[PDB]
Amino acid sequence: VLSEGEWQLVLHVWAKVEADVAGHGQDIWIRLFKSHPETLEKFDRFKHLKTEAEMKASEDLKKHGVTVLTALGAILKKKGHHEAELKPLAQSHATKHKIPIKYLEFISEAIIHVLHSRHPGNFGADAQGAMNKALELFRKDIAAKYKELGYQG
Numbered sequence: 001v002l003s004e005g006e007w008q009l010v011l012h013v014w015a016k017v018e019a020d021v022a023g024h025g026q027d028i029w030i031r032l033f034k035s036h037p038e039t040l041e042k043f044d045r046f047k048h049l050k051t052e053a054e055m056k057a058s059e060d061l062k063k064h065g066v067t068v069l070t071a072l073g074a075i076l077k078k079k080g081h082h083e084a085e086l087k088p089l090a091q092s093h094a095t096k097h098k099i100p101i102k103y104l105e106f107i108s109e110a111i112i113h114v115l116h117s118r119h120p121g122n123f124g125a126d127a128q129g130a131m132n133k134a135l136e137l138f139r140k141d142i143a144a145k146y147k148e149l150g151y152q153g
């Protein structure tokens with residue numbers, strides 16, 4: 001359970017992400033797909049992208065980043081009371097997309113890397129710790145739902 005202070009560190013940096021969610025999403029995809037190429041294979045719609053240039057030029061990938069980060073933002077704004085938001089997400093990711101918890105760890109790492117790079121003014125050690133705590137809570141709760149849905153994760 002995160003403290004209100006921790007949630008505020010999370011929400012304060014997210015406020016910066018929201019100045020341009022599309023741009024942050026692109027950086028996150030590039031970071032994720034380069035650090036862990038295997039994750040790209042899970043996207044039938046994007047697995048043909050061969051380079052960072054192609055990823056950057058993809059309007060659909062950009063749009064999906066907006067979708068993903070907006071969904072994550074809604075979860076973070078719930079400050080732990082995200083039961084309703086997690087249900088549809090866990091169901092599609094467990095049953096249709098088949099995304100292991102390990103891959104969720106990979107994208108969490110990419111998110112933190114990008115925030116660390118773009119936002120040193122709001123992403124110092126304490127802020128990063130709070131964000132990591134929030135993402136771990138997210139993954140913990142997703143894992144529990146995966147279990148209920150019958151997916152090993």
Ligand code: HEM
Binds near residue numbers: 068089092099103104
């Ligand atoms: C921060 C974690 C994540 C969030 C908030 C998230 C959110 C979303 C949302 C909102 C959608 C669209 C609706 C749906 O199908 O549920 C989606 C689709 C999808 N997600 Fe995720 N996702 C996350 C992580 C991942 C990861 C790590 C992978 C893959 C390694 C993944 C693979 C997919 C796939 C394959 C789709 C379908 C894309 C398409 O439209 O072709 N997701 N995700």
Ligand SMILES: OC[C@H]1O[C@H](O[C@H]2O[C@H](CO)[C@@H](O)[C@H](O)[C@H]2O)[C@H](O)[C@@H](O)[C@@H]1O
Binds near residue numbers: 101105136139140
């Ligand atoms: O922070 C680094 C550790 O990250 C992962 O573990 C955290 O998140 C898991 C959920 O994805 C939890 O099960 C675990 O309890 C958390 O500590 C990773 O699995 C660990 O190997 C890393 O050391």
